[PDB]
Amino acid sequence: VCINELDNWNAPLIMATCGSKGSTLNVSQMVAVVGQQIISGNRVPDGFQ
Amino acid sequence: MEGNAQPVNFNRSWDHAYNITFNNQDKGLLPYAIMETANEILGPLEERLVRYDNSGCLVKREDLNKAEYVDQYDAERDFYHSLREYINGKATALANLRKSRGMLGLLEPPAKELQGIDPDETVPDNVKTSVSQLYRISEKSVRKFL
Amino acid sequence: MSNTLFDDIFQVSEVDPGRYNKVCRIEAASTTQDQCKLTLDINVELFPVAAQDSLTVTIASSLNLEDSATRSWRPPQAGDRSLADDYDYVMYGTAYKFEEVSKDLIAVYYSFGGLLMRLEGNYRNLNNLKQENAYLLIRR
Amino acid sequence: VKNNLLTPKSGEPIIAATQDFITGSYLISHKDSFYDRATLTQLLSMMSDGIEHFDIPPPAIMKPYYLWTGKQVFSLLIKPNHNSPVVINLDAKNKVFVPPKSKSLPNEMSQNDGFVIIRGSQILSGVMDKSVLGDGKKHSVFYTIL
Amino acid sequence: MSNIVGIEYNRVTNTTSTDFPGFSKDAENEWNVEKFKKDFEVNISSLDAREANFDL
Amino acid sequence: PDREKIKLLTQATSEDGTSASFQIVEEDHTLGNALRYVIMKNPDVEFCGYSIPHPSENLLNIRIQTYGETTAVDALQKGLKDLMDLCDVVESKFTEKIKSM
């Protein structure tokens, strides 16, 4: 949603449009949502009880 | 080696050959004319390969690819086919174009007959300023390609 | 007069400044011919355009209108009558690709140093060779 | 290092522009980057140390004022003048490449600049975004002059 | 033109000189010391010791 | 006089004085930026840029390139004579406003 709804001349956009450094997922964790942490193919298993 | 694990990159090497000898002032060639201009060069490359049999001498020209007499090289002669049955794709596109643009669509080499029928005088000059204007193949434009 | 290789009058269709700020792509529609039309990129910070507007499109070559061992480029002098002293916006570029759209419909590709133009004709545009130089010639 | 621009792992050009030499050469090749002569002189004078002799192509925008684009300046670092023997031909796809209407429009007429075309060592389309001048991909600019 | 840097919310524009002959077809603004002598001006603002302020 | 100064590069010059490249010792961007602008207002010149090779060492390279009208060595001799007058017209206008206050 961010890529089509962010203005041009945006620095995390303009260096992810290139292959300089970053991705379309790296900027998305900085502005919108960071996702769910995985642990070796497991979605944070239970600690106790 | 170049892309797709082949040492050619036929598409880029075509345009690199095309731009270096591009001239509208030259004449151009016919679809059958380029194939004999091609086989002038890669022809004698093929007869330097001898294809001996498993015992000393040669094998008979009939039934060559029989999975018994594959000698120490086969991709080298296959590469000469791989360039041959590529550049006829450039030939068929010119043959398929001039057919539907009013001119006689010719791809076969004509026999020993009235040489230089030259359909310039047959069709009007709008066709000569149509076929040669879209795309064209000069005689040097193949001798620097292969 | 012998230098004009193409001339028509088109009405534009829409103007799209998609994700830019100083270069926008315009559409065209011929109000005289019913077949040809073009696409083109126009800097509108020195040549403004609006949709549903009619202008002059002209493709000539060697605009000196008649007739220093440096291999460079130099501009013409101050007092010099020439072609397109009456227009508003001329450009520079080369042709690179000639291919057919359909039966008796061919596409012509100019590139003005990244700025593109794709139009199509019906062998009306016979004069336009695959030349090195070509100028566009536009009044408002 | 002149003998080892290519890795023996695959044959790919391993030395390239790193994570900000792209974004320097990207803002130059942006489509809304226009320059007068006074700045086109100063940019072309900083790619060398004032030693290489250049020749200026005619500008893009001509009638109101004379304006060069942000691509002809990139065309000169490849071929500084006629005395340099380098002339290349290449077609390549950028990292993003939003597709055109995909049946009538060819790859060049993208919504962005997208697909890059150079003929006779001049920029005709496209930008440079690490797939054209950088690492990883085989069909890069620095690969071809090598 | 109009020798104004056009600022906005995300950019500025035309910050360069564009004051040389050979920029358009009509080569105006050539070098002339007397045509500069008519136009150059110095304004002095609040001036005192230890500190100065003045316009060019 | 001295000769540890402006010095034409024989390797990167034309057969005539149309194009040349000079090497200035002991002058930073303070001179090269000013000298670029006074030259570019000559209608004869087409190309005049400058650069620093390496900021640890201390030298400047000015590039000059013009048409066949005037030799370029004559152009910057006009050029660096021309800002000497420009330093005066600022000095004359400024010092009369000081005394007037």
Swiss-Prot record, chain C:
| UniProt-annotated location(s) | Nucleus
The terms under GO molecular function for this entry are: DNA binding; DNA-directed RNA polymerase activity
TM regions (residue ranges): none
List residues modified as N-acetylserine.
S2
Might you report a single GO cellular component term? nucleoplasm
Q: Which one Pfam family would you cite for this protein?
A: RNA_pol_Rpb8
Q: Give the GO biological process terms.
A: nucleolar large rRNA transcription by RNA polymerase I; ribosome biogenesis; RNA-templated transcription; termination of RNA polymerase I transcription; termination of RNA polymerase III transcription; transcription by RNA polymerase I; transcription by RNA polymerase II; transcription by RNA polymerase III
Q: Key word Hydrolase present in the record?
A: no
SMART domains tied to this protein: RPOL8c
User: Would you say which domain of life the source belongs to?
Assistant: Eukaryota
Keyword set, alphabetical order: Acetylation, DNA-binding, DNA-directed RNA polymerase, Nucleus, Phosphoprotein, Ribosome biogenesis, Transcription
Q: Where is this region: Non-specific ssDNA binding?
A: 16-39
Give the UniProt family note: Belongs to the eukaryotic RPB8 RNA polymerase subunit family.
Tell me, how does this one assemble?
Component of the RNA polymerase I (Pol I), RNA polymerase II (Pol II) and RNA polymerase III (Pol III) complexes. Component of the RNA polymerase I (Pol I) complex consisting of 14 subunits: RPA135, RPA190, RPC40, RPA14, RPB5, RPO26, RPA43, RPB8, RPA12, RPB10, RPC19, RPC10, RPA49 and RPA34. The complex is composed of a horseshoe-shaped core containing ten subunits (RPA135, RPA190, RPB5, RPO26, RPB8, RPB10, RPC10, RPA12, RPC19 and RPC40) where RPA135 and RPA190 form the DNA-binding cleft.
What else is on record for this protein? Present with 6210 molecules/cell in log phase SD medium.
- What is the protein name stated in its UniProt record? DNA-directed RNA polymerases I, II, and III subunit RPABC3
Q: Which organism is it from?
A: Saccharomyces cerevisiae (strain ATCC 204508 / S288c)
Curated annotation (Swiss-Prot), chain D:
Places the protein is found = Nucleus
Q: Which domain of life is it from?
A: Eukaryota
Q: What else is known?
A: Present with 6020 molecules/cell in log phase SD medium.
Name the protein family: Belongs to the RNA polymerase beta' chain family.
The UniProt function text for this chain reads: DNA-dependent RNA polymerase catalyzes the transcription of DNA into RNA using the four ribonucleoside triphosphates as substrates. Largest and catalytic core component of RNA polymerase III which synthesizes small RNAs, such as 5S rRNA and tRNAs. Forms the polymerase active center together with the second largest subunit. A single-stranded DNA template strand of the promoter is positioned within the central active site cleft of Pol III.
The record's note on quaternary structure and interaction partners says: Component of the RNA polymerase III (Pol III) complex consisting of 17 subunits.
UniProt protein name:
DNA-directed RNA polymerase III subunit RPC1
Instruction: Tell me the stretch of the parent sequence this chain holds.
Output: 537 to 682 of 1460
Curated annotation (Swiss-Prot), chain E:
Q: Which domain of life is it from?
A: Eukaryota
Q: Quote additional remarks.
A: Present with 13000 molecules/cell in log phase SD medium.
Give the stretch of the parent protein shown, with its full length.
1 to 56 of 335
Places the protein is found = Nucleus, Nucleolus
Ranges in a coiled coil: none
Q: Describe the protein's quaternary organization and the partners it interacts with.
A: Component of the RNA polymerase I (Pol I) complex consisting of 14 subunits: RPA135, RPA190, RPC40, RPA14, RPB5, RPO26, RPA43, RPB8, RPA12, RPB10, RPC19, RPC10, RPA49 and RPA34. The complex is composed of a horseshoe-shaped core containing ten subunits (RPA135, RPA190, RPB5, RPO26, RPB8, RPB10, RPC10, RPA12, RPC19 and RPC40) where RPA135 and RPA190 form the DNA-binding cleft. Outside of the core, RPA14 and RPA43 form the stalk that mediates interactions with transcription initiation factors and newly synthesized RNA.
Q: What is this protein called?
A: DNA-directed RNA polymerases I and III subunit RPAC1
User: For this UniProt entry, which segments traverse the membrane?
Assistant: none
Q: Which residues form the signal peptide?
A: none
What is the similarity comment for this entry? Belongs to the archaeal Rpo3/eukaryotic RPB3 RNA polymerase subunit family.
In this UniProt entry, the residues modified to Phosphoserine are S17
Q: What does this protein do?
A: DNA-dependent RNA polymerases catalyze the transcription of DNA into RNA using the four ribonucleoside triphosphates as substrates. Common component of RNA polymerases I (Pol I) and III (Pol III) which synthesize ribosomal RNA precursors and small RNAs, such as 5S rRNA and tRNAs, respectively. RPC40 is part of the polymerase core and may function as a clamp element that moves to open and close the cleft.
N-acetylserine: which positions carry it? Answer: S2
Curated annotation (Swiss-Prot), chain F:
Q: For this protein, what is any one GO molecular function term?
A: DNA-directed RNA polymerase activity
Q: Does the keyword Ubl conjugation apply?
A: yes
Covalent cross-link Glycyl lysine isopeptide (Lys-Gly) (interchain with G-Cter in ubiquitin) as placed by the record, residue numbers: K93
User: Where is this chain primarily localised?
Assistant: nucleus
Compartment annotation: Nucleus, Nucleolus
In the record, the note on similarity to other proteins reads: Belongs to the archaeal Rpo11/eukaryotic RPB11/RPC19 RNA polymerase subunit family.
Query: What is the protein's quaternary organization?
Result: Component of the RNA polymerase I (Pol I) and RNA polymerase III (Pol III) complexes. Component of the RNA polymerase I (Pol I) complex consisting of 14 subunits: RPA135, RPA190, RPC40, RPA14, RPB5, RPO26, RPA43, RPB8, RPA12, RPB10, RPC19, RPC10, RPA49 and RPA34. The complex is composed of a horseshoe-shaped core containing ten subunits (RPA135, RPA190, RPB5, RPO26, RPB8, RPB10, RPC10, RPA12, RPC19 and RPC40) where RPA135 and RPA190 form the DNA-binding cleft.
* Protein known as: DNA-directed RNA polymerases I and III subunit RPAC2
> What is the protein's species of origin?
Saccharomyces cerevisiae (strain ATCC 204508 / S288c) (Baker's yeast)
Q: Say which residues of the entire protein are included here.
A: 42 to 142 of 142
